[PDB]
Amino acid sequence: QLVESGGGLVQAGGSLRLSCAASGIDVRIKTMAWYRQAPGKQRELLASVLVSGSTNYADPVKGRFTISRDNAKNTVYLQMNKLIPDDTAVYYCNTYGRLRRDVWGPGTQVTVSSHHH
């Protein structure tokens, strides 16, 4: 079981940190990755962290997002800096096995607004 949290409404240029809390499975010995699904776009990979700690990032998030693992909390974080409105999506976290079985958590909604309405 994977539980995403930490999302909400933030302003352009702000920041957020999402958390992927695991229970029943051990992220310390699993390659962990973050994803996002836009309103009308295909779900895309954003960042992954290997068991060794090596990280890889996709093009739209390089230099803005940072993936990290907290072994003590059995949790994987996604630090989201330099946010822009195009980052609006529901973000997901997953292992490899759950990815190929299409097993996904509820995800956490991230809304980046240009201004307060």
| Site of interaction with other proteins (CB under 8 A) | 29-31, 33, 35, 42-45, 48, 50-51, 56, 94-97, 99
Provide, rounded to whole angstroms, the least separation between the CB of residue 29 and other proteins.
5
* Between 13 and 60, CB nearer to other proteins: 60
Relative to beta strand 89-94, strand 108-113 is antiparallel
- Find the shortest distance in angstroms from Cβ 98 to other proteins: 9
- Contact between 67 and 57 under an 8 Å Cβ cutoff? The reply is yes
Query: To which H or E segment does residue 97 belong?
Result: helix 96-100
CB of 59 to other proteins, least distance (A): 13
Q: Which lies closer to other proteins via its Cβ, residue 31 or residue 66? A: 31
Of 29 and 72, which CB lies nearer to other proteins in the complex structure? 29
Of 3 and 99, the one with the shorter C-beta distance to other proteins is: 99
- Report the number of secondary-structure helices (H) and strands (E) in the chain: 1, 10
Determine contact, residues 55/69, Cβ cutoff 8 Å: no
84/10 Cα distance (integer angstroms):
9
User: Smallest gap, in angstroms, from Cβ of residue 51 to other proteins?
Assistant: 6
